[PDB]
Design a binder for this molecule. Structure first.
Ligand SMILES: CC1(C)C[C@]1(C)NC(=O)c1cc2cccn2cn1
Ligand code: NI
Length: 305
C-alpha cells in the first residue's frame, strides 16, 4: 500500500506522547536552525525525518510532545532515545533564568524565543554534515546531505513522493571510487575531505567507537582530536563538540558571532577574525554565560535570524 505522512488526528493510535512543555522545547526553532539538516515540515506543525535507520514524525501541543515511528506505536526503549536526543533531562528554565540574571541583552532578547536547545546527534552523522558546510547556507547543505544519503546510504521507507535513507557508514564513504561519486553529487573540494576523514576514522583509529570515546573525554582533548582530521577546522570542531560529543561549553566562532559580540556586547580582540581572536571570543562567552555557553549561543542565533 501507498504510505502517507502521518498527522495526529488522522492515525491517532500510532502516536505516543512525552510530557514536555513548549517553553522547554519548540520544534520549529530547533529542527531546521543549522543544527541538523534531516528534518522537513511536510504538513503544518509536523516535522518528519530520520533517526538511525528509522523515519519519525514529530509534533507538539502546549504540554505534550507527540511522536510516531514508521515500520504500531513507539516502544518505551524508542521513547528513551528521543528523551536523550532532545536532552530533556537538562532543564531549560533554570538556564534561561541563569543567563537572564547575568546578561541584560539575553533578558530582553530571549523573551520571544523560548524552547531553544541543542540536539544530541550521532557523531558520524554530525561530523560529515559540517565537513560539507563550507560557505554554504542551510538550503544548500540540506540538499547535499539528502543526495549523500540517497546515493551512499541504505533505503529505509517511502512516504508520499519522498524516499528516506539512513546516513552512510564509514565503509561506504571510504570506498574505491568514492571521490568520483561524491563529486558528481556537487560537493566540490569537500568530497576529498569526506574520503580522507572516512579512511582515518575507519582504518587507522577503529570506527564509530573512536568518536564515542571523544564524548567521554574532556572538551580540550575532544576539540584537539577533531582538528587533526582532514577538512575539520576550528569552527567545525566546536560545532561537533557542542552538537554530538556532549560539550555545552563549546562555542563555534565565525563572522556572525563576531557581529553579535561586537554590536550587542561591545567586544574587541586584545591585539578582524583570526585563530587567536576566535579562541579569545569563545572564552569570553564561556566566562559570561558559564558551562552551557553553546546553548545560550543557539538562543541568540534563533533570535537574530
Ligand atoms: C547552517 C549554517 C549555514 C552552517 C551555519 C553557518 N550554522 C552554524 O554553524 C550553527 C552554530 C551553532 C551553535 C549553537 C547552535 N548553532 C546553530 N548553527
Ligand atoms: Ni567597535
Amino acid at each position: 500500500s501507498h504510505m502517507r505522512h502521518r498527522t495526529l488526528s488522522s492515525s491517532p493510535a500510532l502516536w505516543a506522547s512525552i510530557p514536555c512543555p513548549r517553553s522547554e522545547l519548540r520544534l520549529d526553532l530547533v529542527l531546521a536552525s543549522g543544527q541538523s539538516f534531516r528534518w522537513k515540515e511536510q504538513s503544518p506543525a509536523h516535522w518528519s525525518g530520520v533517526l538511525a535507520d528509522q523515519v519519525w514524525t514529530l509534533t507538539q501541543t502546549e504540554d505534550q510532545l507527540y511522536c510516531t515511528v514508521y515500520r504500531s506505536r513507539p516502544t518505551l526503549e524508542e521513547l528513551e532515545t528521543l528523551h536523550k536526543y532532545f536532552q530533556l533531562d537538562v532543564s531549560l528554565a533554570q538556564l534561561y533564568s541563569h543567563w537572564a540574571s547575568v546578561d541584560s541583552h539575553f533578558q530582553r532578547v530571549a523573551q520571544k524565543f523560548q524552547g531553544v536547545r541543542l540536539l544530541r546527534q550521532d557523531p558520524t552523522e554530525c561530523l560529515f554534515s559540517f565537513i560539507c558546510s563550507s560557505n554554504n547556507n542551510i538550503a544548500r547543505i540540506t540538499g547535499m546531505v539528502e543526495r549523500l544519503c540517497q546515493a551512499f546510504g541504505p533505503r529505509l521507507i517511502q512516504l508520499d513522493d519522498v524516499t528516506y535513507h539512513g546516513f552512510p557508514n564509514l565503509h561506504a564513504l571510504a570506498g574505491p571510487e568514492a571521490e568520483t561519486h561524491l563529486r558528481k553529487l556537487g560537493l566540490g573540494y569537500r568530497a576529498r575531505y569526506v574520503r580522507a576523514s572516512a579512511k582515518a576514522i575507519l582504518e587507522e583509529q577503529g570506527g564509530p567507537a573512536w568518536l564515542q570515546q571523544l564524548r567521554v573525554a574532556p572538551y580540550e582533548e575532544a576539540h584537539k582530536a577533531l582538528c587533526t582530521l582532514p577538512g575539520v577546522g576550528a569552527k567545525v570542531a566546536d560545532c561537533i563538540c557542542l552538537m554530538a560529543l556532549d560539550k555545552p561549553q563549546a562555542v563555534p566562532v565565525d563572522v556572525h558571532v563576531w557581529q553579535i559580540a561586537h554590536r550587542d556586547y561591545g567586544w574587541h580582540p586584545k591585539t578582524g577574525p583570526s585563530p587567536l581572536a576566535n579562541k579569545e571570543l569563545g572564552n569570553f562567552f564561556r566566562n559570561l554565560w558559564g558551562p552551557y555557553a553553546g546553548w545560550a549561543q543557539a538562543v541568540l542565533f534563533s533570535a537574530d535570524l
